[PDB]
Nucleic acid binder design. Sequence first.
RNA 1: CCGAACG
RNA 2: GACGAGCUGAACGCGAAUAUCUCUUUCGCCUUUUACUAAAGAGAUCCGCGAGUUUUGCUCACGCAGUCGCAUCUUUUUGUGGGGCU
Lengths: 100, 65, 90, 88, 26
Amino acid sequence: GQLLTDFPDRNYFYLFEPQAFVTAKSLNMCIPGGPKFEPLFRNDINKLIIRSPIRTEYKVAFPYLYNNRPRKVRLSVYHHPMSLYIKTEDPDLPAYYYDP
Amino acid sequence: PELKRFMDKKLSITLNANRHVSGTLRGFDQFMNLVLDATVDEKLKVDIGMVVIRGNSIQTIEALE
Amino acid sequence: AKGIGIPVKLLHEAEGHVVTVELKSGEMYRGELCDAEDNMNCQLKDVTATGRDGRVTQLAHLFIRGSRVRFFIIPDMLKNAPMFKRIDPK
Amino acid sequence: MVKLVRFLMKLANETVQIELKNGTVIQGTIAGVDIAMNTHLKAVKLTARGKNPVSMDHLSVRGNNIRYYILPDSLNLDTLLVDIDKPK
Amino acid sequence: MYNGIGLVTPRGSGTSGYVQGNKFNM
RNA sequence: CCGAACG
RNA sequence: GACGAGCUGAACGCGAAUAUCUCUUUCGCCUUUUACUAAAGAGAUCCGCGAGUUUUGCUCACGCAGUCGCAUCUUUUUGUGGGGCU
Ligand SMILES: [Mg+2]
Ligand SMILES: [Mg+2]
């Protein structure tokens, strides 16, 4: 453990799994703590509305909704169900216990 | 048992040696004893009141409804 | 279930169909079996009674004690039960 | 476990007779008797009430409609009588 | 992150490829 | 980013 | 109605680890070629890996043996008998 340091959930990497990075490279847009990838390949203002910015986790979390010309991609941010496990610490408590 | 679907209903119960007693059901057992209200002997034309019939004393039962 | 032989589960899967019932007394009973017992007590509906003298009578429902009953006549449609096929040599 | 069906199921390959509940006569060889007293016979002839005999290569008879058995005169009864008290 | 700004490849252009946010933005 | 040969 | 560890053979197949190469292109190093960069593809190779009987090598082990060719009160194998009419 002290080398593992602690366990991973399939959870945490919602935009950090491979699929995040496939969607990243296919759109030439990269996670903030995420690596670089050079291109794979190479809009009226009055009629288009901005109330919130199309962010990169946005186009990265729905690649075909938010991106014109997305391709060569596998799937996107699909989430594993939430995990209601918390580390029981001390071996004296019952095996089965209510978390506060 | 399906006698449960019959609760409080007028019945025609046939018994051994060709006998008919017709009375609104009142209850039954696992041994299919049957208690009836206002039972009528269809042979002699007599309303015989509340009765209990034995299990193997039940050939068949019909529902007039 | 465990302990129970095939033909009574045949009788059960015959549920919801129109079948015939011969009892040891010789009269015939054609109707839609609602459900039946481990002890072959069964409930049919839309009942045709064929008495010993050819008498044809209309009965709405029937509950038949099994140890009163001689045999059952069941559609060969239902003779395709998984027991029938599974046991079969082919 | 009764004594007597305990005795009867060891009648395998016994060439014996049987009387039925309604009066039918059967002479044939016991291929098996089971805990329900139902017997399957081989090398059989069955003769119904007032009827001509008809022979059967094999026959099945229900334990309940059996009136009785006629056993061989050549029977070592006290051979098959031991072990009936033995539970297996 | 790369919210639609600048170089896709920081290879043949002559910088180390870091995109700092303006502390002067309003 | 980042170094070796040859001419 | 019934019994393996280790090696080489099997002939079929790519949990989680991945490096190299070739080709067709683009891009960048940039005098040239090697040697490289990073993109797109198309192809190989390496280092390994799983199951079937083939036994080679046990250093283990066996055969009256675990198994053979549901057991008396109303619903089941302890049946309601007997007679006789067309
Ligand atoms: Mg030259
Ligand atoms: Mg020169």
